[PDB]
Amino acid sequence: TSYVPDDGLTAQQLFNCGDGLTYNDFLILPGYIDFTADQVDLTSALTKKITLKTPLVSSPMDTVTEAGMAIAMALTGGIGFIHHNCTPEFQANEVRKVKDYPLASKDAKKQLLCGAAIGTHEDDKYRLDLLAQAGVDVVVLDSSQGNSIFQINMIKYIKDKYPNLQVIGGNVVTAAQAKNLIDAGVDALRVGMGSRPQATAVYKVSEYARRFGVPVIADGGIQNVGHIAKALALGASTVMMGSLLAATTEAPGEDKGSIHKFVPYLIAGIQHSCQDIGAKSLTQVRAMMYSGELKFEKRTSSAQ
Amino acid sequence: TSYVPDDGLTAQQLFNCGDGLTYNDFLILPGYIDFTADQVDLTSALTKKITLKTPLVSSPMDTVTEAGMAIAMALTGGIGFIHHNCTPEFQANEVRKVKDYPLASKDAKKQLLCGAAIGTHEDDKYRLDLLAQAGVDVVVLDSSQGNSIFQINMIKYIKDKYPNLQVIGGNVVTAAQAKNLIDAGVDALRVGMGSRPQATAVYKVSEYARRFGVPVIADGGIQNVGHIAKALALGASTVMMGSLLAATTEAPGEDKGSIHKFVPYLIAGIQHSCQDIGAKSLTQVRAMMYSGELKFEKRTSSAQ
Amino acid sequence: TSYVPDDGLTAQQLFNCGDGLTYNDFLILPGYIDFTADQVDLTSALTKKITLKTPLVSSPMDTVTEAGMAIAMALTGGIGFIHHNCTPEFQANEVRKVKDYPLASKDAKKQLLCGAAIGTHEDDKYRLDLLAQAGVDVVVLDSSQGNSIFQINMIKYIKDKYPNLQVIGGNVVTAAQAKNLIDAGVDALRVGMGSRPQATAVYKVSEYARRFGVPVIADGGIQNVGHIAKALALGASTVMMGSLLAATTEAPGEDKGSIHKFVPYLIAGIQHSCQDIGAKSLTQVRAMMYSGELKFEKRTSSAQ
Amino acid sequence: TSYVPDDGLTAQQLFNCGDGLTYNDFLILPGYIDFTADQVDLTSALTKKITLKTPLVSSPMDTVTEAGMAIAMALTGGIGFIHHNCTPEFQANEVRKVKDYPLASKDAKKQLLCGAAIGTHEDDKYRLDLLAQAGVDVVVLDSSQGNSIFQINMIKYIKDKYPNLQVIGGNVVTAAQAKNLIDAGVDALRVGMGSRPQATAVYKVSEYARRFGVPVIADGGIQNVGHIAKALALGASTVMMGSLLAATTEAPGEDKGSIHKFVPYLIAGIQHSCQDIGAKSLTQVRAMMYSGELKFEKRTSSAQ
Ligand SMILES: NC(=O)c1c[se]c([C@@H]2O[C@H](COP(=O)(O)OP(=O)(O)OC[C@H]3O[C@@H](n4cnc5c(N)ncnc54)[C@H](O)[C@@H]3O)[C@@H](O)[C@H]2O)n1
Ligand SMILES: NC(=O)c1c[se]c([C@@H]2O[C@H](COP(=O)(O)OP(=O)(O)OC[C@H]3O[C@@H](n4cnc5c(N)ncnc54)[C@H](O)[C@@H]3O)[C@@H](O)[C@H]2O)n1
Ligand SMILES: NC(=O)c1c[se]c([C@@H]2O[C@H](COP(=O)(O)OP(=O)(O)OC[C@H]3O[C@@H](n4cnc5c(N)ncnc54)[C@H](O)[C@@H]3O)[C@@H](O)[C@H]2O)n1
Ligand SMILES: NC(=O)c1c[se]c([C@@H]2O[C@H](COP(=O)(O)OP(=O)(O)OC[C@H]3O[C@@H](n4cnc5c(N)ncnc54)[C@H](O)[C@@H]3O)[C@@H](O)[C@H]2O)n1
Secondary structure: OOOOOOOEEHHHHOOOOOOOHHHHHEEEEEEOOOOOHHHOOOOOEEEEEEEOOOOOOOOOOOOOOOOOOHHHHHHOOOOOOEOOOHHHHHHHHHHHOOOOOOOOOOOOOEOOOOOOEEOOOHHHHHHHHHHOOOOEEEEEEOOOOOOHHHHHHHHHHHHHOOOOEEEEEEEEEEEEHHHHHHHHOOOEEEEOOOOHHHHHHHHHHHHHHHHHHHOOEEOOOOOOOOHHHHHHHHHOOOOEEOOOOOOOOOOOOOOOOOOOHHHHHHHHHHHHHHOOOOOOOEEEHHHHHOOOOEEEEEHHHHHH | OOOOOOOEEEEHHHOOOOOOOHHHHEEEEOOOOOOOOOOOOOEEEEEEOOOOOOEEEOOOOOOOOOOOOHHHHHHHHOOOEEOOOOHHHHHHHHHHHHHOOOOOEEOOOOOOOOOEOOOOOOOOHHHHHHHHHHHEEEEEEOOOOOOEEEHHHHHHHHHHHHHOEEEEEEOOOHHHHHHHHOOOOOOOOOOOOOOOOOOHHHHHHHHHHHHHHOOOOEEEOOOHHHHHHHHHHOOOOEEEEOOOOOOOOOOOOOOOHHHHHHHHHHHHHHHHHHHHOOOEEEHHHHHHHHHOOOOOEEEOOOOE | OOOOOOOOOHHHHHHOOOOOOOOHHHOOOOOOOOOOOHHOOOOOOEEEEEEOOOOOOEEEOOOOOOHHHHHHHOOOOOOOOOOOOOHHHHHHHHHHOOOOOOOOOOOOOEOOEEEEEEEEOOHHHHHHHHHHOOOEEEEEOOOOOOOHHHHHHHHHHHHOOOOOOEEEEEEEOOHHHHHHOOOOHOOEEEEEOOOOHHHHHHHHHHHHHHHOOOEEEOOOOOOOHHHHHHHHHOOOEEEOOOOOOOOOOOOOOOOOOOHHHHHHHHHHHHHHHHOOOOOEEHHHHHHHHOOOOOOOOOOOOOHH | OOOOOOOOHHHHHHHHHOOOOOHHEEEEOOEEOOOHHHOOOOOOOEOOEEEEEEOEOOOOOOOOOOOHHHHHHHOOOOEEEEOOOOHHHHHHHHHHHOOOOOOOOEEOOOOEEEEEEOOOOOOHHHHHHHHHHHOOOOEEEEOOOEEEHHHHHHHHHHHHHHHOOEEEEEEEHHHHHHHHHHHHOOOOOEEEOOOHHHHHHHHHHHHHHHHHHEEEEEEEEOOOHHHHHHHHOOOOOEEOOOOOOOOOOOOEEEEEHHHHHHHHHHHHHHHHHHHHOOOOOOOHHHHHHHHHOOEEOOOOOHOO
């Protein structure tokens, strides 16, 4: 005998089905473990040409990221984006403060990476110029809705006035929006609006974006390691966290400890999560769910 | 490449599908922004021949509307209906108290608009006569269920004994009910009963009513700007608010401030909401959802 | 034009559809009002040969029914069943205490009706004999699950040793169970177990039972007038209430007032509910939902 | 007439349907009672060659099972597994402490049964050797995810170095995982991970495992007698309880009383539950749901 029929759903049937799901609406069926967790490689792609030893990224929120944070984040394997809710002069001053840890994220010159947010209005161009000076590695046009002529133009701009600077498009949740931002020439995409339901939004935008070599950043909703694993598993290349970090020490302010103990923790969990599903890298988990090897299963409200 | 398949649901498939939805059961997928929010025109139709610079309307509730309120409402772009839970003499006295702000809603003689509720019994005819005198612009046969012979007759009555006065039909939730009220000759419709689930009720009654040129007032359930935008987007021409206003200053009684700061706020949000979905007027948003350009997506309970 | 397509669901499609619904899982679409509420006739059938001027019935619970209650209930239009959680001698003593109000429920000799619960074991036969003496009108074999050989036999028994006494079968939720109890010869049925979901249970058991002329008592879950109206509308001939009454004065013990003010209230609401849906009697409401004139609509969890 | 159509769902349609259900997502339709509860035989199979007079099994949790508990459990009809969160020397010392009650679970030599958990790493082999000495009856490779090469090998090991010792495989939730553990040669299976949703997990793994004569232990989620009955009814041969017992007296620590009063209680309820559905043994309940005689019905979130 020994034939075993066939597990649950395939990412496709589940996230193209008038569903509209969250991270908590489904679980993932385990696989075959035949190696240890510490062998799981979490290397991820932040933008077409920026790569991290971990998929973690902090949010451009005054209550979250600022030099202090941006630094730890990079030392430990991630990267941070400074909030533009301050004087342009104050922001670029943060960017420069930032500019053993085998994982440390560094530029082509041994320096910790740093990114920062900027609006899509005129006055922002100046801010940009200060930021570019302080040696910023990447910029993220920070908007709740990004499929606008005001972002498309700010993109075509920066893409020209600064060819070696990587640009990340404003928040989108459909492939109809992503198209435009990818034509204007963005180097990555920030997915999230309402935290459309997140999981379904990530699934959809990644599925289109990969066809062009554009990474996707799962932005919003991450509450625990689980959500992170589910967000990567659906297509996201990296994950952005806001509130889940606002209680660390490196956070600007008056729970948890330093980013130097928390981040390691997260990385541990995530590899452990990649073991349970029998994948050795994150790249492999994405390949599995697109092929149909990785199976899922919905949970009822009362089943949560 | 660059083809992008096709977004979520179309208002139709979603609100004719044994669903029975609320404002919180679904979200709307964003569109293409290529203009500023302050360019969004919120002009709406209260009744076949009454038109406002904003879709806002206050409720005929003693805890909400009375002269003071009715006035602000009109100065700012809306309109109010005085509650008939008082002596006929007291009600019409409110109507007369009422009878820069470029938006100010005015009659053909520079006077702020005013409306008021009245029952469908005999004794109400008198009340009417006092109200008509004080110069009331519109009357709304105020009932929990309006598809009755007692309203059909009160309609045919008022429609005759007062040809220049606009009549709004009592609360309905189906197109089977709306038919009768539209034949008796109402000039508009008040949709809501149980706050059937509201969103599905608005969708349905508007879809039928538009075929006759009869506006629909989304009555009940509005808790925040979002619900307002969703209610208009489904077909409603205007929106009536009760409790969301009962905490303003212009409200009769012993949170929030004056209607002169709140209303502006609401108008701001609503245009902003119309931007996110790429529509320039409310008229355009309705045209988009009826055509199938505007897309939606359901959220699970646990996805809320 | 004026054609109006077609309202929601038909009781059938909705309660034979792997649903498993509660009273709160759905609402009923309004109809055409063309008469006043006080014209609604609430006459209902308790058992094949017992008939009440209202569908109300109190529960055989020590915390609810006992002589005092049983009396009010009948004076006002209902009927009560005394709890058998006491000495047989004490129970029959209650039955005898019981043995203007135009609605008053009376026997063929001007006496208030009274019913009472009894087990299905040997010792219960004696209890019965005392009860029959005190002039009890009806008996209800009181069990959580009634499709047993121990009830079938207690039925065939009582049906013989007392031909003029009406017997009500123990709690069932399927038509598979009802069959047996109806063959043993019961004169009515008590539906409810888990308060299977109630609404679906009532629907199902009534649909089968009517084919034999056996009334059904919706037992359990009634929290407000609404549930009562929905329970009758689904097929139930009468409704049994436990906790909703335990806070009246006529209740045995140390909220609400007397049954003489509460019951009237309930009757008022129920007629009002029968108006909203355009039915003049309860008999008519049942006829409407079986024909397909009466329409329903499900509500999502988040739509409740 | 008297034909009665056909009850609800069949375990199959319901637990192979992209559902993902919990114990609370459904109920079971009653059957035909024609015998007393105390006639219900709860004999169950713990492992291919271990059999208990009741399906109860305590959890390998320091907050739950340890000698004291393990003993009561066996005296009353169940069995316990000592937690390996202690020195190997301390664990085997518990096993030996353990090594009228007609139900008492005993070895071939009049001694109370005892089982215990052990990891799947090298160092665990030693622990094993101490445990085997103290006369342990069964071992349960204790892991959150069991489909690993590290468990498959620890199985093939123990199966050889100790032929008369019964081995239970680490936690699984699919038949894809169960296959491997059954080939390595386990004598039973522990189902549960996330407490995939439990009910659906039990259903699935039992359905495959029975084809090989391998019992399944429903592990996790049991909160009351009901869940226990539903877990057995779906295919499980026995049920493991953690927290529901942590408040007994026999539990290690500083609610409820002794296991000698609680367990009886549970057994009583469970037979009563087997009566309501007309089954005389647990073996019969499983046979009924696999044949399609036993019917179920889903409940909406708002129907819970
Ligand atoms: N990530 C998210 O989804 C999210 C949610 Se709230 C949030 C944060 O909240 C902020 C506010 O959201 P907004 O939609 O206001 O975003 P943004 O700050 O981009 O402002 C959008 C408004 O700015 C206008 N605008 C931009 N450039 C313009 C120009 N050159 N000329 C004329 N009008 C122009 C837009 O048309 C629009 O109404 C965002 O900047 C971001 O920092 N992000
Ligand atoms: N908008 C809503 O959905 C809603 C919910 Se409660 C609510 C407010 O609550 C009030 C009460 O709801 P009701 O259903 O009682 O509404 P209404 O005040 O219209 O009264 C309805 C009752 O009045 C009777 N009636 C009306 N005219 C009659 C006449 N000429 N002869 C004989 N009977 C007549 C109806 O037949 C019915 O039973 C409403 O008037 C309204 O102010 N509105
Ligand atoms: N209405 C309801 O659904 C409901 C829920 Se609880 C509830 C009340 O709780 C009480 C307990 O529920 P039960 O299932 O125990 O109901 P009941 O009091 O009918 O007792 C049932 C038990 O009594 C046994 N029994 C009855 N007659 C017997 C006889 N002559 N010989 C041998 N065994 C016999 C049954 O086989 C069964 O295990 C009910 O009597 C009722 O008063 N009613
Ligand atoms: N029953 C359950 O579902 C459940 C949930 Se939490 C839980 C308890 O929590 C504990 C922890 O869960 P874990 O997944 O850590 O389970 P376990 O204690 O089996 O440890 C698993 C980790 O140990 C590693 N491992 C095992 N043998 C190894 C070997 N010989 N060489 C190299 N690596 C090896 C695995 O590859 C894996 O990453 C379990 O042991 C159990 O006691 N059980």
